[PDB]
Write an enzyme that holds these catalytic residues in place. Sequence first.
Site, short mmCIF file in Angstrom:
data_model
loop_
_atom_site.label_atom_id
_atom_site.label_comp_id
_atom_site.label_asym_id
_atom_site.label_seq_id
_atom_site.Cartn_x
_atom_site.Cartn_y
_atom_site.Cartn_z
N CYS A 101 44.10 32.25 22.76
CA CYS A 101 43.41 33.53 22.93
C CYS A 101 42.22 33.42 23.86
O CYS A 101 41.20 34.09 23.67
CB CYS A 101 43.05 34.17 21.59
SG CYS A 101 44.52 34.37 20.52
C1 LIG Z 1 35.68 32.02 18.90
C2 LIG Z 1 36.62 33.00 18.18
N1 LIG Z 1 36.26 34.27 18.07
C3 LIG Z 1 37.01 35.17 17.46
C4 LIG Z 1 38.22 34.79 16.92
C5 LIG Z 1 39.11 35.78 16.19
O1 LIG Z 1 38.94 35.54 14.81
P1 LIG Z 1 39.86 36.33 13.72
O2 LIG Z 1 41.32 36.15 14.05
O3 LIG Z 1 39.51 37.81 13.75
O4 LIG Z 1 39.55 35.80 12.36
C6 LIG Z 1 38.64 33.48 17.00
C7 LIG Z 1 40.00 33.18 16.35
N2 LIG Z 1 40.48 31.80 16.38
C8 LIG Z 1 41.22 31.47 17.31
C9 LIG Z 1 41.48 32.55 18.36
S1 LIG Z 1 43.30 32.75 18.26
C10 LIG Z 1 41.79 30.06 17.46
O5 LIG Z 1 42.95 29.72 17.08
O6 LIG Z 1 41.04 29.20 18.00
C11 LIG Z 1 37.83 32.55 17.64
O7 LIG Z 1 38.23 31.23 17.73
CL LIG Z 2 46.02 36.50 22.03
#
Ligand SMILES: Cc1ncc(COP(=O)(O)O)c(C/N=C(\CS)C(=O)O)c1O
Ligand SMILES: [Cl-]
Lengths: 405, 405
Positions: free
Chosen positions: B363
Amino acid sequence: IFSVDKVRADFPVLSREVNGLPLAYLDSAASAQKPSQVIDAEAEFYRHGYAAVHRGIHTLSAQATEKMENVRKRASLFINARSAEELVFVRGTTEGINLVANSWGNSNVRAGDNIIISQMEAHANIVPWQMLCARVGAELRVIPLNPDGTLQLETLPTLFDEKTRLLAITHVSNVLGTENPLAEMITLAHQHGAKVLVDGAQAVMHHPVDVQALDCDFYVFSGHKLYGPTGIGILYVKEALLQEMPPWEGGGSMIATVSLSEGTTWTKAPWRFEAGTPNTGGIIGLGAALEYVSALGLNNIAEYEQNLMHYALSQLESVPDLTLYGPQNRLGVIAFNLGKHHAYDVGSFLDNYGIAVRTGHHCAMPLMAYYNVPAMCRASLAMYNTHEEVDRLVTGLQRIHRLLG
Amino acid sequence: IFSVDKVRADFPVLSREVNGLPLAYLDSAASAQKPSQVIDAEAEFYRHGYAAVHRGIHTLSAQATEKMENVRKRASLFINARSAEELVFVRGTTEGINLVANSWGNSNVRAGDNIIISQMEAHANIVPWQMLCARVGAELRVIPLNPDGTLQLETLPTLFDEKTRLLAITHVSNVLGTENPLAEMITLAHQHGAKVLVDGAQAVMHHPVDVQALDCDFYVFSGHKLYGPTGIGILYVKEALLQEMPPWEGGGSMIATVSLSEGTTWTKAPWRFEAGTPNTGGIIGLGAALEYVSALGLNNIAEYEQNLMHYALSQLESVPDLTLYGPQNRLGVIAFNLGKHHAYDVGSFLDNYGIAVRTGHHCAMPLMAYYNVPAMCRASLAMYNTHEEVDRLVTGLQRIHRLLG
Ligand SMILES: Cc1ncc(COP(=O)(O)O)c(C/N=C(\CS)C(=O)O)c1O
Ligand SMILES: [Cl-]
Ligand SMILES: Cc1ncc(COP(=O)(O)O)c(C/N=C(\CS)C(=O)O)c1O
Ligand SMILES: [Cl-]
């Protein structure tokens, strides 16, 4: 036939004591207790199968994604949707109605159009349309009530016209227990090219529901009222409508690409509308709740509940000065006031006897205003409630009348 | 000192087998496994204490409301917020960032203003600001990266001006493990009257976090990465800002009154921003997760994790053709590619050995584009991972290189 005693054994909260007395939980319309089968299914997922679900490469993640899509399929079959991809996972009925109001409403409802709701709607099916009518400058029209708690259907001709974009209507009232004639109202709405959203929050647990037979365009309900976990609900949308709707909540898993120079594209529905990490724990538990309810049979549930309801209404006749609100063929709930006593006080005495009822406006203030009261008491009679619990409620009201009269 | 063996015993998934081999779960940055203490706290709530939580009259409902407000208080203490009413319960980091972008963004960011993000942001901290900049016609500015995975702080003067309303910045990168100099960037942003939202999704589990010391205006994180249930997260907002924000999601429990003729009024924050039925199950489990983490001590967790990280980086030196992305003092995650092999393939082989890593864009597509790759592998080293699991990963990469080279 249905055995309330066997069913009750599945619900560990029903053993609980309140104020030193055995609990009579008559507040399922606010939220339902959950069976061990639902509680353990979620817990077992966390204990043995947990991972992120984004079609991840490793085994746990891939199996977890599959479990979640299986629950989507099970839910579509539960409401007889044509396809599993017509169901979106939302936090609950409230979020699901907002989603429709923002995504579909913002691009199909223009200034000078109108939306029709009813006077018995819960706030969840009022505020989103008020906020929307503000944004786009449209008119919120209201189907009024009859004294018995039914809609005044004779007013429909003055409310429907060529500029009616949407009828948003409750399937079953959370206060009156009225079940509305959805099939016919949907036929009328479609004759004007209006879409219909059905608020099914108080319907899915009482009898089978079939969105192909209703022909509604949207249908919403909440997992927690369906003996399931909190934090999860279902939005059904006809595939043709759903594939045209733009996004709402934005982030990972609902994008297809993100570029800081070329902008962002979105993935197909239903996944377009599920941003961030889904509530997998809740989804697992909701799957189990649907299986549990299907195993008992909604037609057997309906039959037991209707008999319990008819028994309660019969016994309540012996409570002096009791005012009941709603029709005689109500589902699920009995709304009442006792003499001139405040509902808050009546409910406090019933809780002192270990009987949990709801008091207040029930998130239906326009319904309270129609009846010219500020509040009502409400008892829910669910599939795990007993004739003896009805008797405790009747005796409790008699005692309260005698003590405070 | 900290005992990984005692900690591991609390996590039932860690006994699991994948592909016939013992699981090495190195994907906690996607989502963390949960201890029995968290799983059972939620399950026990459902078994003995469940009710609706709307300051309802009866005992279960009143006790359930109290439990939820206690978790809010516990969470505020966990991040050292001044007041519990500065915390909003959201579905997760993604929903929390959207909430700020819609409620606060729509009324503080006007045409011709700018918002600054960084090039290492996850999609959750990009798309909401893109969508917002569209709506209000503002400019999304981007802090670029250095090859080592740190921000090019020398470009800040060209990005900050008088029309900068907001800096949205990650605390710790979910790919590079870079920890950003938040305290200083916040000082700079405040000198221009810009607010700062911190995306703390990858920070709260690695070391103590103190929002009064950071002086950030908003801070978000997700329960499921903090060893807690899915479906729950925390949005911290400074009280002065939060009491001025208008609503977003509309319905019951966030209204004060609803009238079909006089319109609708809203209740005070934080409750203004919690519509419908809260995810009480998740809130209970999140409370337990915070207690569990506090009992181990974030400073002991940090110390163990830093040693595990330093061990892994040392051992990975013996993997031929391994490319690592990010700085040497990374937290939590190691992003890499192995020779010219597709990350998808590398991750598939590691899963075949029972090792769960994440592959793909994480992401963070603009971050992938900066490094001119389409995807990376990523291993998370959490508080329950072991030196032996690092060794399996190192041996696995060596085997994959030899087999596919
Ligand atoms: C730095 C960061 N900011 C927001 C989110 C979204 O969090 P949420 O899904 O709403 O709980 C993530 C999710 N983790 C991920 C992204 S897909 C990963 O696998 O590193 C993040 O890392
Ligand atoms: Cl994504
Ligand atoms: C008919 C109806 N439509 C929507 C909702 C909101 O559902 P949600 O909270 O999002 O799961 C409810 C909630 N139930 C209530 C209202 S407060 C009750 O106690 O009767 C409802 O009855
Ligand atoms: Cl309300």
